[PDB]
């Protein structure tokens, strides 16, 4: 039948109750909104005056001001910007969701040195969050003054003004509520301005007695081309931004172009702050500025957890914002920011590497973050390993790299050897490396608890696999003569192996002969599938580990024998003389226990070993 | 001069662009918005049909429907609600910020128990997130069937429709986009409904053929004194998809300015993902008017109570415009306190079932021991919830409040020994004297017990005193103290002699009062790290390497003044000041006692070499 056609309308009585009650949750960004509007006005007048320099005839110093007057209980914001006429008053302040900034920016030449904040059109009505009836004064260059008095009560009364001349520019006058009087102080206003709008391009002056005590004395240098800034101005900017009393260690300046564009600065601090791995509620390191206005700082998506030490600033031009201008829409975007920040931090480390004078300063403070990223980050595990420095046998006191070990490696070795312990003196003197160091092959010391987690996820390097020296098969590049020597020793030492096995039941899986000892007697090793000897000491002290899996993947101990020690050479003869001798059944157990103490294992009820030692002390004392 | 008075306005195109673009971040909540509207209409008609039951003559079943149609892209949503006349269409669907739901709910008679899920006035226009041309067929009981159509372009047509009858009830017919066809699969719509809009009181039926999506009626809205445990189990199994019945349950409500209902379930078996994911704390959910709002945002539940599962419902909270998060973040500081205070009582009434408490404490002990460390306010309530093994208990764990009742008349502290297993600490050299006098020792074997004891320091007025720390004070007789005094008066030469021998590894050599059979032990100082705390703080892999040198144990050797070996050693020490055997035996004894005390021996190759050297003398090599 017939079709009636209508037009959409808006309930202008609830549409403002929404904007005031619901959209805005923080009753502090009213000052940010007003400052941003003043900045729009100043940018407008500055861009317009680029053609006819006589526009500044009514006023020359572009600026912003704040004049809290507690006697009147009003927070005046004097200004010297473009202003706006009567028709502009009625068509910009009285129309919800209408903004002259966007219409002005859409009508300027293609490409200009201007970028304005604000496109939605509801920012000004946030000033009734913390204020009574508002009063706006204005003076354009093509009109006279016009007082504007509204109270968000369905009315706004433009009228003629007869007060003092302003020359050129707005003068907002709020009226703070009785309980919100706490924004007329020095401390609160300073904190809000510094937090939100510190990087505004025009001077801000707080007239409170009169002392023009400027609040914006730092300037954003990430906009300037990097080639223009000296390596010392970065230091001043770092000191001002972070309050640190020492200059930065390294600095990175890069930009990205495409459908997502932003600029970024990355400073590596000199000395790592204490309590670095504790604060889980606030990390706020990589701030996010959109058109030089604070947006957010706390979002793990910005940078992985293991890059917590990097402190910098990231600025973007046209990201999409929530209606409150505090949260980032399309939270899937951050997967590009993270991917672009990480691969640049790694290039920063790579370029810091070729200066081996302060790499010690960097490493001594930030080694743990690298060794944790190797465990967690599964994509950069290749480029994150070449930045590791490890103490080796053929070095002494100076740390060396894995790429130096590979460069010094023997022509016959087919793997990289390493040993895990508690300190360096304990590791160097250990029994396992006695044959590796005797042949001449280098060894890698790993004296850090995080090294076990680092080497679980590392399996090779430059095509060469990391094989330990406390596991089952340590295939030395052995000469063929020692093959037949091993055959003779094996065929000459069976009975002792079975006799030791039958006394060491349910403790050791199988007693074998050794190929990694030169002077020390029997040593205890573990099996391939399962935690190593040292890792048990860690995993049994984590204090947040389930108790069900301890007995499932523990270990498989394997005793060994050095076929040259007199202690075992005579023991074999004593065993062959009488395989059930009591002294043998005590000596083998004592030797097993004192070899177990050599490795990084621990016993159960060591009192049974203390008593064994005390009894044979009493034997020597004649008691 | 003159004061010109005007009135505010609103630009329609900009407002529409705002609402479409920059309000909602998830394009998948149009379905919950339309389902909320459907349930609003159903509640309207269900309330209307009370006073005048003739309203249900045009149809008597209350339901919701959904009919995806892939051949021509639509997504129907059939209802049986109050419907809308022409005036309602014109003055509700054409005004941005006007809501008839609020006006209807402002005219309730006195207190009618009906709750609607719309206040804002915007949210119908969230359909244009995924829809090209919405069509709303409608039929009230007063005015005939009208067809409504708009492309959200500042225009909408209210036709007069002669098509098929509906009887009574609206029928939204979306026209989905070209790349938004993904919302017609059974699985996708089923999952979206299950996640967002599951707990609504009216059946939802997806014609693919009547698989009602919501079979589980809510039970937190019923008086808890009317629910049997079988219903609680059957609701737990549906809520958490668990094949195992629950273990405990709490049902409390809070009245006042901030009101809410809550259920709390304690699972039977601890999941293997605790302390692991540390990304999403989705255990506790937040419902407002039986609609999903947000999962647990961190401060809802403290970390040490991560195992609690439950649901929280409320009738009035300050929701954001997107209805996806609360506005004021001060609510989640009172809700946390209320939930914690309720859980710490649920545990208390769980305690009195001794046969049932073991099944809980066997799997959820680490959480309590961490809460003692972190919850600085609830230590006096997490202290009586601990059970520990003792020397006079065998295989039956006992609580500290049971220990205090068995205390001797002369006891002035609580003794405790810490190690790495029960077998070691049962036979260690430290308890050899305390056990002798019939005193009750408390065992502590888990690593988290080191953090637990470090922050307790008290119980019922008693102070926790370790047995590996210097200064242990046992009730002694007058004869005993003078015997110890004369023993100290006859062992100064040997004490200073062996002190001269070492002079670096230990700082004193005293006379013992806690050893009976072991000749010598080692105890640390009172201001430092315990013997086992040091061994624990060298396996964190993320720590400050510097601070170990400043807060470190300060060893203090000890000697049993009656064991034969040291008694004979005193003879050789006084006879000759620098006999080789003496200066070897003291080092050997020190290292042997250093191994037995749980200390990480330094450079064990030397201690091994000593044994390998002195076995040869036994064999005469």
């Amino acid at each position: 039948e017939e079709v009636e056609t209508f037009a959409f309308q808006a309930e202008i009585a609830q549409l403002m109750s929404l904007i005031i009650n619901t959209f805005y949750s923080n009753k502090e960004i009213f000052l940010r909104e007003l400052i941003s509007n003043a900045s729009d006005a100043l940018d407008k007048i500055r861009y317009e005056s680029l053609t006819d320099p006589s526009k500044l005839d009514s006023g020359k110093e572009l600026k912003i001001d704040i004049i809290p007057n507690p006697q009147e209980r009003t927070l005046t914001l004097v200004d010297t910007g473009i202003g706006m006429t009567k028709a502009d008053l009625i068509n910009n302040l009285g129309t919800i969701a209408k903004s002259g900034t966007k219409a002005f920016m859409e009508a300027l030449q293609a490409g200009a040195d201007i970028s304005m904040i604000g496109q939605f059109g509801v920012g000004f009505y946030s000033a009734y969050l913390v204020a009574e009836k508002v009063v706006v004064i204005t003076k354009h260059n093509d009109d006279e003054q016009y007082a504007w008095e509204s109270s968000a009560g369905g009315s706004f009364t433009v009228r003629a003004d007869h007060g003092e001349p302003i020359g050129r520019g707005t003068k907002v006058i709020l009226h703070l509520k009785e309980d919100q009087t706490e924004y007329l102080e020095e401390r609160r206003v300073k904190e809000v301005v510094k937090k939100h709008s510190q990087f505004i391009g025009y001077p801000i002056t707080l007239y409170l007695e009169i002392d023009q005590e400027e609040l914006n004395k730092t300037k954003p240098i990430w906009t300037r081309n990097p080639d223009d800034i000296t390596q010392e101005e970065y230091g001043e900017f770092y000191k001002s931004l972070t309050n640190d009393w020492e200059d930065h260690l390294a600095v990175k300046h890069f930009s990205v172009e495409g459908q997502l564009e932003f600029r970024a600065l990355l400073f590596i601090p000199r000395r790592a702050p204490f309590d670095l791995f504790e604060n889980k509620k606030k990390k706020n390191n990589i701030k996010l500025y959109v058109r030089r206005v604070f947006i957010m700082d706390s979002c793990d998506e910005l940078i992985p957890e293991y890059l917590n030490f990097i402190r910098g600033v990231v600025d973007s031009e046209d990201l999409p914002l929530n209606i409150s201008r505090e949260m980032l829409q399309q939270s899937k975007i951050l997967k590009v920011i993270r991917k672009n920040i990480v691969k640049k931090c790694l290039e920063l480390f790579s370029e810091l590497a070729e200066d081996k004078e302060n790499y010690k300063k960097f490493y001594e403070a930030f080694s743990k973050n690298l060794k944790l990223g190797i465990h967690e980050d599964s994509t950069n595990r290749r480029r994150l390993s070449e930045l590791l420095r490890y103490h080796t046998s053929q070095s002494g006191d100076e740390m060396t790299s894995l790429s130096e070990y590979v460069s010094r490696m023997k022509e016959t070795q087919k793997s990289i050897y390493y040993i895990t312990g508690e300190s360096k003196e304990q590791v160097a003197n250990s029994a396992f490396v006695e044959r590796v160091r005797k042949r001449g092959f280098e060894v890698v010391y790993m004296t850090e608890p995080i090294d076990e987690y680092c080497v679980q996820q590392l399996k090779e390097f430059d095509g060469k696999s990391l094989v330990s020296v406390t596991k089952e098969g340590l295939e030395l590049p052995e000469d063929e003569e020692e093959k037949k020597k091993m055959e003779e020793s094996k065929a000459k030492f069976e009975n002792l192996c079975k006799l030791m096995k039958e006394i060491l039941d349910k403790k050791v899986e199988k007693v074998t002969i050794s190929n990694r000892l030169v002077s020390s007697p029997c040593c205890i090793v573990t099996s391939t599938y399962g935690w190593t000897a040292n890792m048990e000491r860690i995993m049994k002290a984590q204090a947040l580990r389930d108790n069900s899996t301890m007995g499932y993947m523990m270990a498989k101990k394997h005793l060994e024998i050095n076929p040259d020690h007199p202690i075992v050479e005579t023991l074999r003869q004593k065993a062959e003389a009488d395989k059930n001798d009591k002294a043998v059944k005590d000596l083998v157990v004592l030797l097993f226990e004192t070899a177990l103490l050599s490795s990084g294992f621990s016993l159960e009820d060591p009192q049974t070993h203390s008593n064994r030692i005390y009894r044979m002390i009493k034997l020597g004392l004649g008691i | 001069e003159e004061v010109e008075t005007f009135a505010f306005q609103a630009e329609i195109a900009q407002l529409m662009s705002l609402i479409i673009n920059t309000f909602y971040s998830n394009k998948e909540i149009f379905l919950r918005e339309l389902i909320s509207n459907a349930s609003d209409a159903l509640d309207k008609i269900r309330y209307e049909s009370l006073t005048d039951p003739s309203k249900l003559d045009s149809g008597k079943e209350l339901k919701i429907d959904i009919i995806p149609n892939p051949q021509e892209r639509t997504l129907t949503l059939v209802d049986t609600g109050i419907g809308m006349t022409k005036a309602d269409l014109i003055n509700n669907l054409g005004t941005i910020a006007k809501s008839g739901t609020k006006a209807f709910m402002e005219a309730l008679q006195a207190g009618a128990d009906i709750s609607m899920i719309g206040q804002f006035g915007v949210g119908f226009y969230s359909a244009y997130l995924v829809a090209e041309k919405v069509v709303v067929i409608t039929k009230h009981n007063d005015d005939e069937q009208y067809a409504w159509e708009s492309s959200a372009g500042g225009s909408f047509t209210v036709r007069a429709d002669h098509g098929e009858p509906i009887g009574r009830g609206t029928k939204v017919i979306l026209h989905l986009k070209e790349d938004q066809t993904e919302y017609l699969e059974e699985r996708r719509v089923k999952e979206v409904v299950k996640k967002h809009s599951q707990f609504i009181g009216y059946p939802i039926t997806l014609y693919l053929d009547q698989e009602e999506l919501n079979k589980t009626k809510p039970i937190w809205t019923r008086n808890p004194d009317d629910i049997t445990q079988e219903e609680y189990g059957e609701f737990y199994k549906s809520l958490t998809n668990d094949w195992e019945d629950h273990l405990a349950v709490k049902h409390f409500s809070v009245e006042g300015q901030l009101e809410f209902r809550a259920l709390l379930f304690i699972p039977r078996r601890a999941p293997f993902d605790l302390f692991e994911n540390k990304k999403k704390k989705n255990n506790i959910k937040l419902y407002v008017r039986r609609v999903f709002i947000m999962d647990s945002c961190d401060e809802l539940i403290p970390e040490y109570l991560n195992f609690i599962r439950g649901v929280v419902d409320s009738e009035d909270l300050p929701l954001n415009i997107s209805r996806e998060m609360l506005q004021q973040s001060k609510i989640l500081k009172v809700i946390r306190k209320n939930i914690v205070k309720k859980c710490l009582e649920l545990f208390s009434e769980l305690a009195e079932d001794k046969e049932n408490y073991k099944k809980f404490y066997e799997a959820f002990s680490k959480n309590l021991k961490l809460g003692i460390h972190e919850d600085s306010t609830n230590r006096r309530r997490l202290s009586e919830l601990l059970r520990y093994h003792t020397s006079q208990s065998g295989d039956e764990m006992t609580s500290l409040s049971e220990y205090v009742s068995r205390m001797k008349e002369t006891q002035k502290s609580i003794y405790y020994i810490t190690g790495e297993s029960k077998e070691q600490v049962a036979n260690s050299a430290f308890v050899e004297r305390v056990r002798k006098r019939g005193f009750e020792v408390v065992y502590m074997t888990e690593p988290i017990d080191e953090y637990c004891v470090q922050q307790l320091k008290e119980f019922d007025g008693k102070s926790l005193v370790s047995v590996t720390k210097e200064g242990l004070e046992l009730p002694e007789d007058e004869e005993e103290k003078k015997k110890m005094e004369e023993s100290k008066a006859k062992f100064e030469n040997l004490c200073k002699l062996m002190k001269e021998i070492l002079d670096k590894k230990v700082e004193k050599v005293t006379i013992s009062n806690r050893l009976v059979s072991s000749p010598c032990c080692i105890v640390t100082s009172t201001y430092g790290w315990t013997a086992n705390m040091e061994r624990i703080m060298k396996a964190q892999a993320l720590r400050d390497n510097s601070t170990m040198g400043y807060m470190m144990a300060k060893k203090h050797l000890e000697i049993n003044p009656d064991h034969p070996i040291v008694e004979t050693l005193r003879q050789k020490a006084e006879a000759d000041k620098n006999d080789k055997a003496v200066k070897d035996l003291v080092v050997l004894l020190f290292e042997t006692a250093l191994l037995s005390s749980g200390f990480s021996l330094e450079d064990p190759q030397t201690h091994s070499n000593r044994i390998y050297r002195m076995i040869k003398l036994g064999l005469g090599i």
Binding site: F277, L372, Q542, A543, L544 | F275, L370, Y451, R543
Partner: peptide, 9 residues
């Protein structure tokens, strides 16, 4: 597989 250091002292 997770490093579970717990802030101590």
């Amino acid at each position: 597989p997770s490093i579970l250091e717990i802030r101590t002292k």
